[PDB]
Amino acid sequence: LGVYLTKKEQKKLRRQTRREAQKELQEKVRLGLMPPPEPKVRISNLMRVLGTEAVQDPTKVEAHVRAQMAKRQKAHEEANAARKLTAEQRKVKKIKKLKEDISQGVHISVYRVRNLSNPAKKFKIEANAGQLYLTGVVVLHKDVNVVVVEGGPKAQKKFKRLMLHRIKNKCVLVWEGTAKDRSFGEMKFKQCPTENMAREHFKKHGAEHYWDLALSESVLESTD
RNA sequence: AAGGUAAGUAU
RNA sequence: UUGGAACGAUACAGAGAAGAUUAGCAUGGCCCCUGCGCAAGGAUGACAUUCGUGAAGCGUAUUUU
Known part of the structure; x- marks a missing residue:
């Protein structure tokens, strides 16, 4: 399986990568590949570099400094948006479509x-079954609501907390187990x-x- | 008797 | 022409001061903050117009002195 490098090891790796990139830039500037870096000038820095x-052309200097500041912001904004593009496709289709690996x-x-x-x-139960992609059915009868939900482990853990704590006459899970394959279709009412x-x-x-377990639980509740 | 030598190039 | 002296003479110079001087930015360290990506994980919201006849049921000659 995978391994987890420690915090000190992460710091060392990040420092080495940053130094590698910095040396790349420095040797590019040494050999004239890239122009030598210009001083980074902000408004508080304007009177030290420029x-x-x-004093001769104050507003031209201000415009140049603000153009440099915007270009620094233009690159950062573009970079964040460029990476953000990944979510555009990797969102409701690749950042919200998991299915909890319900195969075996x-x-x-x-x-x-x-x-x-x-x-x-x-x-709300139908919306939670359709949003979490959990199959099952619900059978109604005289003081008996048998709701069977077959799905992934995360969807079952969400539905166990939604039905017992987030929804209010009492609700009790009569059988919580696993099966080989699926038996019920989509979420329907009957x-x-x-x-x-x-x-x-x-x-x-x-x-x-x-149904025989739900009838026996009601008989045992009405007997005592 | 001293502790009072400027140093440096050039022939 | 040919010898003294050569640790000398003269010529030049003489700041024999004191020094690795100094401005800018970026990196690096630290603590936030903001944005995006990555790997997971929490909590929570949401639904599907008029009148008569014929038949059946009900009703407070004791309680408005």
């Missing part, structure tokens, strides 16, 4: 909410007033145990 010529295992979290009659919470219609839909993808 002092004798700023899909973390699946099944939550059983008691009251999910608010459409705002379902819309209402089933009968338990058999939800169990037949959960058995179409081979996940009939999620």
Whole structure:
């Protein structure tokens, strides 16, 4: 795997690179490749470098100094913008499209909410599933909201904190594990007033145990 | 008797 | 013509002063600040116009002395 050079080692590497570039510039100036560097003049520096010529033509000297200052700013601004161009393409397509490397295992979290009659919470859950690229489904029934979400580990860790802490009748994760491949499609909604219609839909993808676990948890909560 | 030598080029 | 002297004589010069002098910028060190890139990571916001007939249900001859 990769190795991490220490802080002193980073300082040494940076110092050596800077000295190499400085020597490159110095030898270029020695051999006449580049013109010799001009003094860097700011407004407070104007009376020290251009002092004798700023009494004869003060405004020409001021204009020359400010042109040099702008050109120094022109290079820096252009450089930052030039590198910024990388994000232009490497942004929502290369700085926000990760997918958490979900290829060998899909973390699946099944939550059983008691009251999910608010459409705002379902819309926020659908937006969190579509933004984090986490597949799954949500089955509604009489005091039973079975929300299964299969995705990456980071998306599952985000959805475990969004549903239990960022969204408010209680929500409890009934099964948190991994699977071989994916079973559910995109994030859709389906209402089933009968338990058999939800169990037949959960058995179409081979996940009939999620409804039987949610029925058993409700039976164990209503028994005690 | 001293501690009081300018040095330097040029023949 | 040919010898003394040559540590001398004369000619020139004589500041026998005191010195690595001094201005500019950049680099380098340090602490911020600003912008961009790189590698990750936090927290959080967002939804889908008039009237009659025929039939059914309801109603406070005890409570406006």
